[PDB]
Symmetry: D2
Subunit: 268 residues, 4 copies
């Protein structure tokens, strides 16, 4: 009766109703999870977005670069879920890389300050969140972050791909920490999804050549995917995150599950 | 109401009540799947074993090297599940390598005839089974085979590790075929499990040095696994197979899920 | 004065003057290696081909499926190189998969007998050759086999890709044996090369669709390769084999060096 | 006559005579390369160290976090090698992670400022150096960085492992840039080497438990390495860097060569 029946799951990374985290949250609630959400910066916006979720969920502010937000997280969530209750699940669906960065836009021209910001928010924050939240997670718990496969370089994604490589590496370390809590840590490597930001990129936000490359990447995905890939549909990835949040992948950690249509297994 | 509520799933590879497939079957039935089982050679034995499953399941003979069994499979299962019904799930949990082979017992001394037999039953049969069964599988279906991680060589498992490397490669091709049917094909790379055969090996069936090496491998697994590994417990791997059989990994194919405690992500 | 100055190196796999092994041999001789060659089946042809090598080299018959050839190899080479001399280098450049097999031509329709033959010649023979030859190899020696990257499935190459997956796995085991002799074992994963057989395939020998797929694969290689890929030029791969045969990769074994233009590192 | 006969090669990362870069430089000079060296911070020390090299080499200051050093590099090297001469080779042998960081010393307790510094010097600087130097590199050129395998998490190395994951990812992007110059970019993943810093760690500089873990890691390396691993001997890795700097790996880029005794191919 619900994949996630009775689980308390924190879901970060909702910014629009096309956010992967929005779908993760929706599916998680459809599957009986009780949610706490974290949002960055535009919390009035995020509350209005998340009102459309099948169930209400407390929305907490988390700027993953903050420190004080991080320090007060755990307390703020236990307050939201009630004293003596702990998280069963944590979803990191946070990513950012300054344009600079990420297209466009010579790889070599991204200032380290921008790269570092990107890696902070996209990779290091996975350890941050796990640090903040593991003290309030139950044995049998699950931390899941959003990834894409960075094992091979690719056009446009540039330093974001590096940030994913760092994230994957971080996840493997987080798994070592999380294990002491009976908690799993895994990533979901998604195929490309037409999120608002992503649509804006294919639309040229970051230069025509970046857009053209992403579109090429999207098409080759689908072709390569033995079961196809629908970049307009985040549900299969939400479902995969929910599988990791459930008790049905109980021996998997420090790992990456590829919700990418099988594209990464193919080549051509 | 059951991860696998209403799914018809064929499960090969039951030979004892400590078989990984036995646990896969049990968990699958606990989760509402309707099963057809295939067994090799000792079908009276296998029926008696499988009587202990929470639900009855037709037991069909399948010797994966046979050809005629393969040719008549599909027909024999549609007969068992009823005309107009198709499989949603297929579990390959079949492995064999002649001792020779697999310890012991110099890698170089395994005759190709023995290796070939091993690869036939352990790798090629995954394509065989998919060939036989995909014509009687539903869109949204799932084929799952049992794997262990062969990306690095290891003591004792010798040609069986090669057979797993071939199996993984076969799986990626099977995924291409299965996709045309809306069907996923994936492997579960398990940590070591104290199956009867495996206990017999650690007990010295294949030489003292093979046994000692497997025991060393088992211990290092557990240590490496951020969440530990219990070689006496096949349930976490059955559960993982069930996750792949469910609709909750819908964008994963040609892939390997590691139900190994996270050990392969670690090193030390 | 010659990368391979003074090394005695056995090179299998010459069948035409466009054979990768022909280029390996030529470059090896240019670099001061003394060669023994092995050839399969058409030894009059192979002698005539190899007369074009910058230096003479004894040509020995080796049918890698034979057993007696294998058993008498070592003796036949020590005879060719002189009593008390041993090999420093061994090149396996042997591959075969029955059409059936390898295009075309449904993956599922390849009979196991054909697959097994393919794996025998393409994967198992690497262990065979190492078994035969390690007793007559010097410490500091190097065994190198020809590979292509099978980590992702691909059109057309079908069971040959599986045979490469098995070969890579075999190589890792061969490395364990070879190490006891102070000998390295590595593979070179080449990009596609317009060998006679390969040109015949792109020309349609194995069906129009196989040809079209290989041509697509060849083009995408080159595009993906950060330094490009020239399928008409086997020299960069011969050179790479020679690097593995030299003393300049002394801490590398059980490994794969990708002489593929960097294509496998890229994606798009 | 010298693997690197006539090549002009810049070698960063010499700080002591046990530095991997010192051995890279020595071997490179033994092989006929003309060197320019870069050193960080303690240039009087570094000059005194490098006086022991078989040949003199101009020593240029490079603090890879500086910007002005980076901007003036290229000009300073062309000055050292003479107008109208360009580099054939670049060696990045630069790594740093604040203790914090790297033992000890909870993974979660490393402040992002420290991690970011580590990633700056250890990963991002590979792109920095390539940016600075590719404009003064010849076609057929080679950039090589020092890596260790971060694909699996490990004790003690903590954020340095993450920095290596980022470095590997950066290398793949650098390969895309370098290719436009006819230049290869590759990494050498070394086994552990008893550098001064490393000896200080195993000696307990970073806590007893970090030391014990590194020693365990070192022992398991050697055991796993089919040809053994000698942590006191940096020569096999210098040689491997020299192989990448030569013309003998001409079709390899965006790649990693494992000079680790074959340990990463093994498991147990
Ligand atoms: N196509 C995609 O949309 C895609 C997205 N993901 C990951 O999915 C996760 C969610 O991204 P999305 O839903 O696409 O985009 P989104 O913009 O909806 O969500 C990103 C979230 O990060 C949040 N965030 C930014 N900065 C901070 C901060 N300082 N503190 C807290 N939160 C912050 C932000 O508020 C937003 O809610 C990110 O980790 C992505 O990298 C992973 C892979 C893919 C796909 O990129 C991909 C790419 C290349 N090859 C294959 C597939
Ligand atoms: N420890 C293990 O038990 C282990 C087992 N698996 C896989 O799990 C699957 C089931 O094995 P098990 O349950 O351990 O052993 P089992 O003996 O219970 O089952 C093997 C089944 O294969 C069947 N079989 C043999 N020949 C034929 C044939 N010709 N036709 C049809 N069926 C046939 C046989 O009847 C039996 O039912 C096999 O693919 C294994 O390789 C995968 C990984 C691991 C583990 O090996 C491992 C090993 C090395 N590193 C890490 C983990
Ligand atoms: N494009 C290619 O030509 C290619 C070739 N290789 C390998 O290079 C090696 C040499 O092949 P080639 O030079 O292309 O072809 P070839 O036909 O010149 O050589 C194959 C050799 O195998 C020999 N052989 C066959 N059967 C036996 C036997 N029973 N005993 C002894 N010898 C036998 C045969 O006589 C011939 O000399 C093989 O292992 C290939 O698989 C590896 C990779 C690639 C390339 O296939 C590739 C493919 C897919 N993606 C990327 C790259
Ligand atoms: N054992 C090791 O010594 C080891 C070393 N490497 C790499 O080899 C490279 C050289 O390290 P080493 O020779 O061991 O140590 P080293 O201290 O001799 O050299 C590091 C150099 O970095 C320089 N550096 C630091 N900061 C800056 C800066 N801001 N600007 C310019 N230069 C700077 C520093 O001056 C020094 O010359 C580094 O990239 C290492 O990470 C790679 C792998 C291994 C080995 O770490 C390893 C580790 C884990 N598993 C397996 C193997």
């Amino acid at each position: 009766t619900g994949l996630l029946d009775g689980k308390r799951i924190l879901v970060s990374g909702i910014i629009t109703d096309s956010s992967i985290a929005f779908h993760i949250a929706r599916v998680a609630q459809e599957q009986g999870a009780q949610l706490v959400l974290t949002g960055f910066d535009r919390l009035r916006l995020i509350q209005r977005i998340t009102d459309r979720l099948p169930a209400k969920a407390p929305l907490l502010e988390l700027d993953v670069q903050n420190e004080e937000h991080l320090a007060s997280l755990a307390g703020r969530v236990t307050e939201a879920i009630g004293a003596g209750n702990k998280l069963d699940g944590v979803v990191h669906s946070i990513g950012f890389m300054p344009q600079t960065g990420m297209g466009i836009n010579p790889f070599f021209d991204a200032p380290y300050a921008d790269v570092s910001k990107g890696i902070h928010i996209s990779a290091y924050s996975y350890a941050s969140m796990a640090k903040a939240l593991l003290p309030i997670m139950n044995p049998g718990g699950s931390i899941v972050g959003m990834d894409f496969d960075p094992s091979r370089a690719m056009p446009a994604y540039n330093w974001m791909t590096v940030a994913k490589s760092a994230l994957e590496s971080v996840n493997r370390f987080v798994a070592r920490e999380a294990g002491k809590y009976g908690v799993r840590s895994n990533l979901v490597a998604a195929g490309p999804i037409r999120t608002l930001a992503m649509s804006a990129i294919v639309g040229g936000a970051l230069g025509e050549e970046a857009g053209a490359q992403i579109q090429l990447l999207e098409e080759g995905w689908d072709q390569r995917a033995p079961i196809g890939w629908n970049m307009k549909d985040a549900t299969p990835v939400a479902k995969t995150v929910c599988a990791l949040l459930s008790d049905w992948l109980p021996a998997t950690t420090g790992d990456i599950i590829y919700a990418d249509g099988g594209a990464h297994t193919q080549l051509l």
